[PDB]
Design a protein around this nucleic acid. Sequence first.
RNA 1: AGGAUGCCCCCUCCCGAAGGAAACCCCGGUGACGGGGGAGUACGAGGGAGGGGGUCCAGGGUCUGCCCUUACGUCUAGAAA
RNA 2: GCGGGGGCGGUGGGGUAAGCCUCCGCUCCGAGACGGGAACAACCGAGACCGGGGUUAAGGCCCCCAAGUGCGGGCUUAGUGUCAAUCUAAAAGGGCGUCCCCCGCCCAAGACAGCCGAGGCGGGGGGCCCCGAAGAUGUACAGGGACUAAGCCCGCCGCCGAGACCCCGGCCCGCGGGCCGUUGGCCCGCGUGGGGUAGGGGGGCGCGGCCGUGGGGCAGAAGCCGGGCCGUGAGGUCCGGUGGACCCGCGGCCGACGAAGAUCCCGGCGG
Lengths: 90, 169, 183, 172
Amino acid sequence: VKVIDVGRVVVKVLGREAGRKAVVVDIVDENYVVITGPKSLSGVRRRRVNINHIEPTDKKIEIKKGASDEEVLKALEAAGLVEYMKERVK
Amino acid sequence: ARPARCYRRIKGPPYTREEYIHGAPMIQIPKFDMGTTSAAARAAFTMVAKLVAEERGQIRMQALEAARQISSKYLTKYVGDANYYLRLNVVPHHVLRENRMLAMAGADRLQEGMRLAFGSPAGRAARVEPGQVIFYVEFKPEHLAHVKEALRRAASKLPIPTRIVVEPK
Amino acid sequence: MIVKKVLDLSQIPEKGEIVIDAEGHIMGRLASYVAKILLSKPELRVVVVNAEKLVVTGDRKMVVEWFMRKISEWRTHYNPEKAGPKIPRRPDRVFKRVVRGMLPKKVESGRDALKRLRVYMSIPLDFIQRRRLVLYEVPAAKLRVRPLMQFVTLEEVWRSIDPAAWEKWNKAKEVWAKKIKQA
Amino acid sequence: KTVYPRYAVIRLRGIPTTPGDIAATLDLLRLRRKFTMVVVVGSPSVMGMIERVNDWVTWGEIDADTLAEVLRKRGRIVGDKPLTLEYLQKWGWNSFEEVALAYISGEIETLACKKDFKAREGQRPPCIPYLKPFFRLHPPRGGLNSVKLHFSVGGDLGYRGPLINDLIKRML
RNA sequence: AGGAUGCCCCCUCCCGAAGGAAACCCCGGUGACGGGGGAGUACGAGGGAGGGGGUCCAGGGUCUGCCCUUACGUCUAGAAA
RNA sequence: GCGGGGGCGGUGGGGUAAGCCUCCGCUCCGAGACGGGAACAACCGAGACCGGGGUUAAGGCCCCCAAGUGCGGGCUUAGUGUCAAUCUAAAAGGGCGUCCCCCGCCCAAGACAGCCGAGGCGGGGGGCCCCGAAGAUGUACAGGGACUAAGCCCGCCGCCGAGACCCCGGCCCGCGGGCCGUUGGCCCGCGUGGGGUAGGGGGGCGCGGCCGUGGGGCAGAAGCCGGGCCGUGAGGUCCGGUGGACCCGCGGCCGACGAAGAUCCCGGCGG
Ligand SMILES: [Mg+2]
Ligand SMILES: [Mg+2]
Ligand SMILES: [Mg+2]
Ligand SMILES: [Mg+2]
Ligand SMILES: [Mg+2]
Ligand SMILES: [Mg+2]
Ligand SMILES: [Mg+2]
Ligand SMILES: [Mg+2]
Ligand SMILES: [Mg+2]
Ligand SMILES: [Mg+2]
Ligand SMILES: [Mg+2]
Ligand SMILES: [Mg+2]
Ligand SMILES: [Mg+2]
Ligand SMILES: [Mg+2]
Ligand SMILES: [Mg+2]
Ligand SMILES: [Mg+2]
Ligand SMILES: [Mg+2]
Ligand SMILES: [Mg+2]
Ligand SMILES: [Mg+2]
Ligand SMILES: [Mg+2]
């Protein structure tokens, strides 16, 4: 079973941003969430995403729902995951 | 008689000119308006129910008569004749033909098969269109359930699908 | 030791042999993948192990009635050994027949592709006693388990349609379980 | 006086089974083979013919750049030779872009000179003399949607608007 | 009686119709994918030149693999019937 | 030739209906190759001189089988179903089975079940599925494997895929022009030129002989067996073996002039 929650770090597995990491910032419905794997950090534009097109990682930051890119960077500095975020899987 | 599926479908022009049709059958339906037919007493009735055709086809005179008896008997038994007006809105103008070897019906009916295949008269039917109003009931609003049941029983005797439409007068 | 891996469909070797663990996989989808692999690699051999743990989706009663009808109503009135059908019941033979249905018919290519396949129930002692047994999974042919979903195993089908042979095989498994766990 | 819109019409369906009236109209419109293209002036008689053959062709308003590119790639002269820019300058046209602009803007009323046209000396003719009045396109790159459905329902047939230029580029 | 000034392999060079990519960078879409550059590029039927290596090549008999394929003559709307 | 046929449309007219009878119009088969449709003359695509390259049409892309176990949402639990027709199906009627849309009423927390505290009742309709649904050689038939999506609905993206369309090379044709002493030959130009039964038109190959002309043959003619080369082809020519005296090229002319078939005739010979 796949679990997606706000603040979870995921990896996009479909699209041009495949293999790049992002952070779940908001939930649209049971099928879509909002991810901003910041464009200034990983190259993932802040957009909606289907649940089928992202795989969750094992690291999570604490943020409010729909948190801005500034808050996402602040939490990334808090968790020390900038270097993890910049990596590209496969 | 043949099954009604033999004459359900409209397959040719209407056959109604009785001055040209030889031995055209009589219309056996004895009456078409049921209940309180006078408009002065129909002024009391405010609800209109309509049994309405859903497909295009032909209804036989016997089928129309059977639906008429079942609906009229139910309405008399459970609403009383002073509380409803029921009209069979269609008349079986169309004359049905059957091609069959038979008794004294012309010398061309003694040749077998499809030779001289124009049939003799076999009955009457009403050609109906979709949305055509087959049965029209005027009633007081308290008898809505009984009127719907009578229309359902009438619809059970007809060869085409129908529906019940209720509205105010 | 058994090392599990994911079969890269574009990275299939052109030579040698590959072993596929069939547990958790759907029978028709895995058979489709195996048939395409055998057709696309003419010199590769394919072994399938754990054939009794294959899954068929649907109601158990529906699948069992389908297999019963196949093994009972399908026959011939001519010489049965010369002309009639011969319906398999054991899970390995059932899976091999399913792959034969997806291979080309009445052709040397289909015959050779079917001959280049071996199917086993469980894992044989010879395979276990190897130094390094590389097993594969095909993720596209694996059943995604969901609540309130209906499916049966080929072992359950075999038990329903042939209880005595299943009992003998299960007893053999229990008899050799100590040596199997040793290896 | 009036400058009607200049349309590109491409025959999308085939020569066998097509009904007789449509076939006759297509033959009169010069779309006698599949994937033949013509450029016409949108007078009412021509629009009546196009409405008659709506279910066998696709048509639209062609632009000057697409017309120039069509003349460069698929233009043919008498004897089936390719149309050349030096041929244009010999006849008095400076470039494919200039002649296409003149035709589309309505400075001239025809692209190809008629069979009865006579060429004088010095004057620039108002057409391209001895040019064939039709183009034979390549099949479209990436395919079409459906040659049996209208463009207005997701198919390919009928009025296409300015998307005929995109189709022509895919078909060049 | 045919070619052996052949045939085949490899390499290299030149030209080349219609057609025509890829990594990678940039813009967009949930996405399968589209677009700008890469690039009318690498390539591409075929047409020329040369280098080395080998012996037969064409053609024929039979067999195998893959692809294709419903005896003939006749009346007939309609023939494997 | 005066036997037509298929699809679609005139509720064509008739008929219970019919792969039924009889009219009207377009198209296709007959007389039309080829791709798809599981096979299949006329359903869809499409019109084929030969060879090669490319791109598309119908339709398809889990395997059989080239191309996607492609993408988003929703429905189905019946293996229902599995992308038009030929082609193998299904009705009235019943079902809150399930998903959903709308309307009337009650509940102002004193509403529906018998003090409790939050929704309840009734009606109409739509989608899928279930019952209605019973056959004869052999499996949930309608291609098979099988699939819980590889089913259905609303949308979407790319790709595969003909002889069609584009390109190259070769061939031939129609028409026009030109040159050569010509019952004819050659060259050039143009053609949204290149299917074809009956039938009409044009040219050529072969067999026996005759009028001419030029030759071969005992150092081996005709015939026969196998083989190479030429020609789209009818056919021609040459090589090796056998054989033992006639034969052939070219122009012209003439016929007892070309066989695969007639329950063909004669002979020989098989299983
Ligand atoms: Mg009729
Ligand atoms: Mg038994
Ligand atoms: Mg045996
Ligand atoms: Mg057609
Ligand atoms: Mg030689
Ligand atoms: Mg006959
Ligand atoms: Mg007959
Ligand atoms: Mg005939
Ligand atoms: Mg025949
Ligand atoms: Mg006649
Ligand atoms: Mg007809
Ligand atoms: Mg087919
Ligand atoms: Mg494939
Ligand atoms: Mg019916
Ligand atoms: Mg079924
Ligand atoms: Mg021809
Ligand atoms: Mg002579
Ligand atoms: Mg003959
Ligand atoms: Mg004899
Ligand atoms: Mg004998």
